Amino acid sequence: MKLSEVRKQLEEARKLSPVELEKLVREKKRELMELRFQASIGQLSQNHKIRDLKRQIARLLTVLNEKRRQ
RNA sequence: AGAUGGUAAGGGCCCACGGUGGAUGCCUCGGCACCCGAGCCGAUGAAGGACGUGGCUACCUGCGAUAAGCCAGGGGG
Ligand SMILES: [Mg+2]
Ligand SMILES: [Mg+2]
Ligand SMILES: [Mg+2]
Ligand SMILES: [Mg+2]
Ligand SMILES: [Mg+2]
Ligand SMILES: [Mg+2]
Ligand SMILES: [Mg+2]
Ligand SMILES: [Mg+2]
Ligand SMILES: [Mg+2]
Ligand SMILES: [Mg+2]
Ligand SMILES: [Mg+2]
Ligand SMILES: [Mg+2]
């Protein structure tokens, strides 16, 4: 993911609420599974997508945590 | 009658070249000594581990299902 896309992701996430954050991680955790399944049958040439999504989820949960922390 | 040399299955000494082996010199990622600096960690779960963790990953390192990494400040270019 591009550095600017990352800022973008953070700014956008930070605007979200916990519930909206949870909904979105679940969606991404789902989108990762598809990637996995594709990676395992040799149909994911674009494999950087996996490291990417995984960190998105991390960023998101990180931010979810931010919110709930105080 | 007499007398003496070429035999090398193999062996010995010497010379040349190799093989084996890893001495010696040079080298140093490491070690050693002293001196200075610094000196506690832990239920907010330590020390130290187990198992995991990479698109493909045996091991080591790093890391913990947010898993060779997440957020932010500073540094740097
Ligand atoms: Mg990042
Ligand atoms: Mg004779
Ligand atoms: Mg002879
Ligand atoms: Mg012979
Ligand atoms: Mg002899
Ligand atoms: Mg020789
Ligand atoms: Mg010398
Ligand atoms: Mg100490
Ligand atoms: Mg430990
Ligand atoms: Mg390990
Ligand atoms: Mg930083
Ligand atoms: Mg910076």
Side-chain angles (χ1 to χ4, degrees), chain A residues 1-22 24-70:
Chain A
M1 222 172 93
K2 269 169 269 255
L3 237 190
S4 47
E5 287 163 352
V6 164
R7 302 189 197 101
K8 198 62 207 299
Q9 199 187 18
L10 286 163
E11 300 187 22
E12 276 302 301
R14 271 156 176 150
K15 272 171 195 176
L16 291 174
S17 82
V19 182
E20 277 157 325
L21 277 174
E22 286 183 347
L24 173 62
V25 156
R26 190 167 301 115
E27 294 167 13
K28 296 198 156 287
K29 273 173 177 280
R30 181 198 162 82
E31 184 185 325
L32 207 176
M33 195 197 72
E34 290 166 26
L35 290 199
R36 275 204 299 281
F37 279 54
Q38 268 179 331
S40 62
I41 72 183
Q43 298 187 349
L44 191 79
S45 35
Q46 283 208 315
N47 58 50
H48 74 279
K49 288 174 83 191
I50 300 178
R51 177 165 301 146
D52 261 355
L53 223 208
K54 250 156 64 181
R55 307 189 184 178
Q56 292 183 36
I57 293 175
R59 261 181 296 262
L60 288 189
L61 292 167
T62 280
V63 167
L64 198 176
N65 197 273
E66 282 177 358
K67 289 301 176 66
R68 317 245 235 207
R69 265 212 310 286
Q70 8 98 265

